Structures are given as structure tokens and as C-alpha cells.
Design a protein around this ligand. Structure first.
Ligand SMILES: OC[C@H]1O[C@@H](O[C@H]2[C@H](O)[C@@H](O)[C@H](O[C@H]3[C@H](O)[C@@H](O)[C@H](O[C@H]4[C@H](O)[C@@H](O)[C@H](O)O[C@@H]4CO)O[C@@H]3CO)O[C@@H]2CO)[C@H](O)[C@@H](O)[C@@H]1O
Ligand SMILES: [Ca+2]
Length: 193
């Protein structure tokens, strides 16, 4: 299936780049998956004094049964990277809610390794409770700043990512955990470490 809307003015696609810093004002190869429930503009905005890729999302009040149907699902296609000696994939994730009071966001990471049936999913989903936020100190520019880590030795289905396993694509999903989130999200500094 494909989720479609009228043409939207994304920032320039650029070229797949890791670490993804967005400093060249392009998306450095990141784009919505064709199945992403969110297909609105991906742009390059300042977040916490750095350029970051960004979108808006307000999850529906009536929640789909499939837990990713409404989710931003952003992908770095055909990067063809490997983890090397790195234990983690990590990135900066920022929120600027207009509404956030209940439920959670559940952030997943996946890869498409051609040797592993084009899917390998990190086991360590990260949940951000929205009631936790009001008590969190914001950045100077009014954001909630998370640095999210995924231990690449914890992968579902017994699949193993070795130092040399080709990762064709990287996917990040920000799923709705029965939440009332509305507002802006941002990614920066997407990298292995
Ligand atoms: O639905 C929510 C549920 O999702 C689970 O993850 C699903 C994904 O939602 C789904 O998009 C993903 O589909 C993959 C599939 O696994 C790959 O095998 C397939 O690979 C393609 C490849 O991309 C092509 O280039 C190649 O030519 O063909 C191969 C084989 O078809 O690509 C599709 C699309 O990326 O499958 C996931 C695992 O089932 C989550 O695991 C779960 O947590 C969520 O709740
Ligand atoms: Ca940046």
C-alpha cells in the first residue's frame, strides 16, 4: 500500500549520509516510507542550535488497530551501511508539543539487511510517557531533548548484526502509545556509536 497526499514541499533529499547531521540543509537521504501514516513535509529546522530534520504530527483520537498505521515512519533508503565496532545506534530526538498529557510515544528502530530477509528490528523499543514531560527541563529554544540509544546486540527473532552485515536501509518509527500528542518532532545526529 501507499499513503498519499498532494505534493508536499520537503527539504531537498540530499544524499544518504551517516552521521546524519542535516548541516547541508538537505534530508541527507531520509524520507517517509511509502507506508508511513505521516506524509507531511519533512523540513530542516533549527533544534537546540543545530539543523535537524523535522515534521508535524497530531495522532488521531480514534486509534488504528495496527500500532504503526498512524506513525511517522522515516527511512534512510539504500545507505548500505554497517555497524562496524559500534555497540549502539543513537540520535537526538526532540519534541515541541502543542498537546501532550497522556499515553506515550514508543520509538522503534529497524534495518533492512539483504542477508536477513530485509528486516531486523532492535528489541529495545523506547517509551516516552507524556505525563513525564511537563517536569522535564526544556532546551533554551523550548524543546524536550532526548538522546535515544539502541543496543545493536539486542535484535528480534534471533537475528544477529555482525560488524560487516550490510544494512541497506535504516527505519525509525515513532508510534502512538494511546497518546494525545500533537506538535513538532525533530531528529539530529543519527549515528552509530
Ligand atoms: O505493523 C506494525 C508492526 O510492524 C512490524 O514490522 C513489520 C513492518 O510493519 C513491515 O513494513 C515490514 O515489511 C518489510 C518485510 O519485513 C521485509 O521482508 C520486506 O523486504 C523486502 C525488501 O524491502 C525489498 O527490497 C525486497 O525486494 O523484497 C523484500 C521481501 O519482500 O520489506 C518490507 C517493507 O520494509 O515487516 C515488519 C516485520 O513484520 C513490527 O515488527 C511490529 O513491532 C509492529 O507492531
Ligand atoms: Ca544538526
Amino acid at each position: 500500500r501507499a499513503v498519499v497526499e498532494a505534493p508536499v514541499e520537503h527539504a531537498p533529499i540530499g544524499k544518504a549520509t551517516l552521521p546524519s547531521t542535516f548541516e547541508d540543509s538537505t534530508r541527507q537521504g531520509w524520507a517517509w516510507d511509502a507506508t508511513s501514516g505521516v506524509q507531511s513535509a519533512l523540513t530542516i529546522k533549527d533544534a537546540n542550535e543545530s539543523k535537524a530534520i523535522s515534521w508535524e504530527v497530531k495522532y488521531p483520537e480514534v486509534k488504528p488497530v495496527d500500532g504503526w498505521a498512524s506513525a511517522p515512519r522515516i527511512m534512510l533508503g539504500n545507505v548500505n551501511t554497517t555497524r562496524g565496532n559500534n555497540k549502539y545506534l543513537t540520535f537526538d530526538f526532540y519534541l515541541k508539543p502543542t498537546q501532550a498529557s497522556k499515553g506515550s510515544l514508543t520509538i522503534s528502530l529497524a534495518f533492512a539487511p539483504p542477508s536477513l530477509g530485509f528486516w531486523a528490528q532492535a528489541t529495545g523499543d523506547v517509551n516516552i510517557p507524556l505525563s513525564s514531560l511537563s517536569k522535564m527541563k526544556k532546551t533554551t529554544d523550548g524543546l524536550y531533548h532526548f538522546q535515544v540509544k539502541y543496543d545493536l546486540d539486542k535484535i528480534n527473532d534471533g537475528k544477529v548484526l555482525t560488524a560487516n552485515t550490510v544494512l541497506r536501509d535504516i527505519t525509525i518509527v515513532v508510534a502512538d502509545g494511546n497518546s494525545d500528542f500533537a506538535g513538532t518532532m525533530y531528529l539530529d545526529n543519527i549515528r552509530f556509536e
